[PDB]
Structures are given as structure tokens and as C-alpha cells.
Design an enzyme around this catalytic site. Sequence first.
Site, mmCIF file in Angstrom:
data_model
loop_
_atom_site.group_PDB
_atom_site.id
_atom_site.type_symbol
_atom_site.label_atom_id
_atom_site.label_comp_id
_atom_site.label_asym_id
_atom_site.label_seq_id
_atom_site.Cartn_x
_atom_site.Cartn_y
_atom_site.Cartn_z
ATOM 1 N N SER A 93 10.962 7.566 -1.763
ATOM 2 C CA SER A 93 11.867 6.570 -1.459
ATOM 3 C C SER A 93 13.094 6.771 -1.040
ATOM 4 O O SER A 93 13.892 5.892 -0.796
ATOM 5 C CB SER A 93 12.066 5.631 -2.952
ATOM 6 N N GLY A 94 13.587 8.239 -1.111
ATOM 7 C CA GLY A 94 14.627 8.660 -0.963
ATOM 8 C C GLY A 94 15.540 9.029 -1.945
ATOM 9 O O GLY A 94 16.657 9.549 -2.291
ATOM 10 N N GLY A 95 15.527 8.276 -3.407
ATOM 11 C CA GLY A 95 16.124 8.308 -4.520
ATOM 12 C C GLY A 95 16.584 9.813 -4.961
ATOM 13 O O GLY A 95 17.681 10.017 -5.449
ATOM 14 N N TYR A 96 15.539 10.844 -4.677
ATOM 15 C CA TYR A 96 15.755 12.234 -4.970
ATOM 16 C C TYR A 96 16.710 12.769 -4.024
ATOM 17 O O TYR A 96 17.709 13.361 -3.956
ATOM 18 C CB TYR A 96 14.478 12.717 -5.221
ATOM 19 N N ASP A 141 14.404 4.949 -6.911
ATOM 20 C CA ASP A 141 14.794 5.429 -8.279
ATOM 21 C C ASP A 141 15.925 6.368 -8.148
ATOM 22 O O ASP A 141 16.590 6.822 -7.123
ATOM 23 C CB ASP A 141 13.691 6.305 -8.865
ATOM 24 N N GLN A 188 11.346 7.768 -15.230
ATOM 25 C CA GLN A 188 12.447 8.636 -15.773
ATOM 26 C C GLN A 188 12.772 8.649 -17.269
ATOM 27 O O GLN A 188 11.804 8.487 -18.163
ATOM 28 C CB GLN A 188 14.011 8.072 -14.892
ATOM 29 N N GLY A 215 11.428 12.911 -12.297
ATOM 30 C CA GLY A 215 12.589 13.777 -13.016
ATOM 31 C C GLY A 215 12.112 15.285 -13.741
ATOM 32 O O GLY A 215 13.039 15.686 -14.466
ATOM 33 N N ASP A 265 2.596 16.531 -5.247
ATOM 34 C CA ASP A 265 3.186 17.043 -4.177
ATOM 35 C C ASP A 265 4.151 18.321 -4.356
ATOM 36 O O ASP A 265 4.843 18.293 -5.521
ATOM 37 C CB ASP A 265 3.939 15.928 -3.463
ATOM 38 N N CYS A 303 -11.493 32.974 -0.510
ATOM 39 C CA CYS A 303 -10.963 31.826 0.016
ATOM 40 C C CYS A 303 -11.900 31.426 1.437
ATOM 41 O O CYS A 303 -12.250 32.464 2.295
ATOM 42 C CB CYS A 303 -9.541 31.727 0.510
HETATM 43 N N1 LIG Z 1 11.819 15.461 -10.562
HETATM 44 C C1 LIG Z 1 11.430 15.332 -9.641
HETATM 45 C C2 LIG Z 1 11.258 14.490 -8.162
HETATM 46 C C3 LIG Z 1 10.751 15.136 -7.057
HETATM 47 N N2 LIG Z 1 10.674 14.100 -6.270
HETATM 48 C C4 LIG Z 1 11.098 13.048 -6.619
HETATM 49 N N3 LIG Z 1 11.261 11.951 -5.999
HETATM 50 C C5 LIG Z 1 11.730 10.624 -6.746
HETATM 51 N N4 LIG Z 1 11.827 9.695 -5.898
HETATM 52 N N5 LIG Z 1 12.130 10.902 -7.936
HETATM 53 C C6 LIG Z 1 11.807 11.891 -8.739
HETATM 54 O O1 LIG Z 1 12.603 11.946 -9.765
HETATM 55 C C7 LIG Z 1 11.474 13.211 -8.167
HETATM 56 ZN ZN LIG Z 2 -7.422 31.518 3.185
#
Ligand SMILES: N#Cc1c[nH]c2nc(N)[nH]c(=O)c12
Ligand SMILES: [Zn+2]
Lengths: 368, 368
Positions: A93-96, A141, A188, A215, A265, A303
Site C-alpha cells: 500500500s505504500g505505508g512502509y 498502514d 500492527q 511491523g 514476501d 536444486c
Molecule cells: N515489518 C514490515 C513490513 C514490510 N512491509 C510492510 N508493508 C506494510 N504496508 N506494512 C508493514 O508493516 C511492512
Molecule cells: Zn538452482
Amino acid sequence: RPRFSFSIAAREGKARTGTIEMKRGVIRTPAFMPVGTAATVKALKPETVRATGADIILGNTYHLMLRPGAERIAKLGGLHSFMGWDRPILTDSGGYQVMSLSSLTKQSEEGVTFKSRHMLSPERSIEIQHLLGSDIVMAFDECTPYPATPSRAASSMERSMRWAKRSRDAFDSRKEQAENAALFGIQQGSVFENLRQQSADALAEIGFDGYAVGGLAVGEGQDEMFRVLDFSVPMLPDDKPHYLMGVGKPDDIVGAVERGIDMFDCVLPTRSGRNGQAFTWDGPINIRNARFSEDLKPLDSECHCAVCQKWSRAYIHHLIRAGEILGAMLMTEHNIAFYQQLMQKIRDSISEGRFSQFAQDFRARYFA
Amino acid sequence: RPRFSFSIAAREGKARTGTIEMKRGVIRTPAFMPVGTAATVKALKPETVRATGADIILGNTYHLMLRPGAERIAKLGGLHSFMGWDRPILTDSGGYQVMSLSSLTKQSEEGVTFKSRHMLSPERSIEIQHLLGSDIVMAFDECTPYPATPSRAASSMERSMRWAKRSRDAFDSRKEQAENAALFGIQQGSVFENLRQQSADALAEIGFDGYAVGGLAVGEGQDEMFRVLDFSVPMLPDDKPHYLMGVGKPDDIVGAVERGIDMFDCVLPTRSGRNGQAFTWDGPINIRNARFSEDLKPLDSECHCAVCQKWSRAYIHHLIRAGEILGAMLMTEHNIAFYQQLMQKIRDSISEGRFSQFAQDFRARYFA
Ligand SMILES: N#Cc1c[nH]c2nc(N)[nH]c(=O)c12
Ligand SMILES: [Zn+2]
Ligand SMILES: N#Cc1c[nH]c2nc(N)[nH]c(=O)c12
Ligand SMILES: [Zn+2]
């Protein structure tokens, strides 16, 4: 296919395996999502990402809104067409990132304004994700810095929950979005149990398609993150996916699945790939190290990736030492493949009721 | 397959089309050879190079002898296994590059010593090419700078011819090499007809599997290079391949085929690819230009490459502007594909006796 359907097909302790069905495809869980800054998974064609076994990739509201622009991508047909990935995409969302990469910020109840002048709010964040054609939209967030005092952690969490409600309503307001995408809320509360509970509760009351644990990737050591996961994930609705944002190393991932997380991720496999770090079942190696200069073995002995069936350590060593693009390509393909093979091993072992033995076995070797 | 067999299947004026059969495969002529500094065609997997239609690639004695080392590559199984290219490889001898890239040089009748301390001579150059497992070995020459006075051009040419004889004998001396590889001599003489003749004659007297035209890619404008090709290529044995080293732009290539050249190499498609230059049948474009930011067309409207069937100008524009590796990948794949499609169009048109009309048509559009 439905807009969104999460089904749990097997369990072992807190761990779960199943599927998320969405309109653009099925996501096997537990899932690792390669990260795709800035409309590319660095050094990989989409088809290569898919071939490693990825079911979904992550895009970023913050970076695409600056370049090439949200409205522009919408004009050109949406992120999927733009980059050539036709499967689900989750957009953060961009929050971070706004607080992480911006050159100057002003936070307020309304949102964040920033220089790289721009404003990002719950409404705009959700609109941008819409414009991109995101399948899984994240609530806007605030990722609380670590460490944090209880007071500041509480204030931040409370704001995030107000923003979660605003995100929900902005999403629902846009029929096209509400009907074709999913919305995930973000827990959070720093490392504090009472705050994580109040957050879990506010999120559940609002209601989301999935619940992210925010977080815990901003300084916490593993022991601390695991301890917080220990009480935090049971607070979330059991029948919805649990997404641990920004995590992590292979061993983080295994321990977090042991605690009930279904989705991950991280930039580690990609970034550390280009820096010469390769993951193996015996631990990570730095391919730049002199001892690989005439090593004819593949990156990893077991692998199945294309890289390990075709090139040697010695070659990749040469490439990275030479700063050759193909080195970055091969390292990244291997690392993402390795991550996906880990997720498959996890899914299969839970399905067969031997996940706890897998985790123990994995750790023994990886840390040997 | 034989060690070496060049057959001409069709002709039109001075232009020729056919095949070179070697043990690792068949080379369709006229041929474009992607250049593979430093055991990689930059930003492409071998399989991708092949998919664009390349039959052979060029490797470099100079760069591989410094990194990762000739003996080391031999230890690891040869250049083909090292980089994962199992088809013919032509290796340049170092003659050019030593003087071009080295930080300090000492030329003598024996060879060149240099700092990047190393010596390169006819014998060592041929030995290094052997160690690499080259299919087409180049004589160790001196690429005369342009312009050059007749005196200095003559002196340089004469040395090169002495070195050509030493290259021949060093090659023949090594049974394994003589039996499995081919040896090409290199004509020098600057832009002077009498020197080019004396050089052609000395080469033919020595006898080689093919004849390269050296020294015409180091400053000469097209008109001048074409004028020198006009008298120079008929001096070479008609029944052997004619290789113009370091050339060139698509229009250089067409004009040189019109003058009897069968083989080309150049870094332009690769290097200029990563800098944002894309070849099209209407001329080269710079994809970084603002006017491509929302252009949904492919790089070129007729190109069959994978890049043009999948991504837009707009996307590639974004990638290159962002310095993303995938931009370099896509640009390079397209550019090499374009070069190969050019060679196919050339081969087919000669085969059908309409090459002169193709060349005229190509020029009209490309220069429009
Ligand atoms: N810790 C951590 C995080 C890594 N990406 C994130 N993205 C958002 N939106 N919020 C989060 O807290 C985090
Ligand atoms: Zn490999
Ligand atoms: N002109 C030009 C050349 C480009 N590559 C070359 N390589 C060698 N060995 N000699 C040559 O003259 C040239
Ligand atoms: Zn193309």
C-alpha cells in the site's frame, strides 16, 4: 473462478496448507511472493518467475506511483499487461516504503506527504492499487519503527486501524475493485501483546479477505519475531490467510509457518542474489569467494532449477566477479527457485503430516 | 560432420549464400556473430542467443586470458561447457584488443607485452585459442590504426603477414587443434590497394580455411570502407569464407554483402541495446526518448522476436529509464534478433536472385 476463496486442505499443529482461488489464478499456500520493484522482478522475465513455481508476485504502490505513474499504467492497460505477468499480483500500500525511501516526509491523520511533492492517504493508496489492477490490495498502514515505546506503538497502531477502516470503505466504494480484487488488513502493535490483540480485534470487526502481520521485519531478531508471532497469529481469524510482510530468510519462513503464516514476501532472494549470495540446503554461500573459482558443481546439489542443471559455480563466480548481467540473472533465478522449492517442501510435508520433522531436518542441515 | 566445409549454394553479383559445416554445427552464410565478451553474450542466456537464430558466436583471446584465464577454462572443460554454448565459436586472436584495452604496451617482432604483465605472440594466441576449445581460430595480427601513412601501413601489414605464417605453423603443430578446428588469416594494408593485394597474396600462399578483412572498423567512414572492400575482397580466394571484422551497422552489413563478405561481428546490437538504441526496419530509435513513454507498439512492427510479441515500447522505455536489468535483457534480445532477421532476409533474397532489389528496398526504408 471466484473473486476470492481460501481453502485449508491440511493442517499440522498451527501450520496450514491450501489454496487461494482468485480470478487470475490459484495461489498455493504457504506461498512465497517474489517482489517486483519497479514493475519487474529484477533480472527475470515473467515467464522465468513462473517457471520457478511462483503463483503470485508483489508490486509496490510507492514506487509505481512515482515511476512510471499510476494513471499512466492504467492508461496502458494495467500492471499485468504492462509487465507481462497475467497471474495474481499483490500490491503493498505504500505505508512502509513512503517512510523508508522518501527524502522528506510529513505524516498526519490524513496520510503522508512526501518528496523523493506527493500525498499518500488510505483513499489514494487504494485508488492507486485500483489503477494498477491489483488482485490483492493492502490496507494503507503505518509500519511502526522498532524498537518503539508502548505509547508510540499504541498511537501508531490506533492510527493504522483508523486507516484500515478508511481503506475498507474506499475499496468497497469502487464496485469494479470490490468485485474483482481482495482486500487485506494489516496488524500492527510492535512487539506488545495487548496492542496486537486490540489490532487483531479492530481488523476482524472491520472484516477483510486476509490478515497481514505488519511491523516484524524492521529490526526484530528472529527470537523476538517468533515470540510475537506466537501470540499474534492466533488472534487473527483462522479461516483467512495470514501474511507475514517482509519475511524472510528460509529459516524465518519455516518457523513462521510453524506459527500459522500462509504468505511471505522478501527481497532477499533477488537482492542478495545480485550481490553474490546463493541459497543452498546446506546454507547460503557467497559465490564471489575464491574457493568457487574452479568448482564445477551447481549452486546446490539437489536444486532442480534450470541454472543448476546447466551452469557451474565456477562460471557464475566468474560472471559475478566480472559484474556481468548474466550473473545477476542466474543467481536470481536460482535463488527464487530455491525459495519456491522450499515452499513446496513445506506444503507437501504439511499435507503428509511430517512438517515438524521436515522443519527439524531442514534446520539441522541448513545450520550445519 | 567434417572439420570444415564451406559450400556456396547461390550467388548474385559479388554476393554469396551458403553454409559452413563444422563439427559442432552448420553456419548459414552470410552470418552475423553475436560477440561474447567475457564468456557471455551480455544479458542473454546461450539458449536465447540460439533462439534469435545465431549459428555461431565470437569469444575473445584477450579478455578470457585475463579473466578467468585460458588454462583455467581448459581445466574446467573448455569455453563451450563453461558458458553453455555447444555450437561453433570463433575466437578473435587478441591482435586488436591488446592494443585497444591495455594500460601499457610494448610491441616487438616477437609479439605484444602488456599491462591491464603479459605477453601475447602468434604462438601464445594460438595456444590460448586451443585451450578455450575454439572452433574457428584467428591468426594473431596487428590492426593498423586509421588513418595510417603508406609507410607505417606497409610495415604493419608485413609484420602481420610474418605473424600469419607463425600462426599457421603453430596451429598445424597441435594435432588436436589442426584436426578439429579451422584457421582464418587476416588481411591488413589499411586503405591502400597495393598493400591489400600483397597481403591477400601472402595469405593465399600460406593457405587458410577462411580470410578475414582486418583493419576497416577503426575509424573509416562507410564510403571509404566500401571503396576498400571494392578492390580488397576479390583479392581473396573465392571458394573460402570472407569475414569482415568488427562490422557493423545494418547498412554496413548489406553493402558489405554486396561486395562479397560472408561473415560479420559487431558489439553494436548488444552495447547499443543496453544504452537504449533499438534497431527497426525504419531505422534505429532511442527508446529512452520521452515520446515512447505511452507507446504501446512493439520495438518494431514486423519483428518476430519474443520481445516484440510480448512487451511494449512503453514498458521497455520505463525499464531502461529505471536502469532495470530486464531492460537490458529485452533490448539486447530484440537487437540480436533483428540482426539475425536481417541476415535471413539477405540469405533468402540472394537464394532467390533478388538481393539487389532487397538492398535497395532496405536502404529506402531504413534511411527514411
Ligand atoms: N515489518 C514490515 C513490513 C514490510 N512491509 C510492510 N508493508 C506494510 N504496508 N506494512 C508493514 O508493516 C511492512
Ligand atoms: Zn538452482
Ligand atoms: N578493423 C578491425 C578489427 C576488429 N577486430 C579486429 N580483430 C583483429 N584481430 N584484427 C582486426 O583488424 C580487427
Ligand atoms: Zn523484436
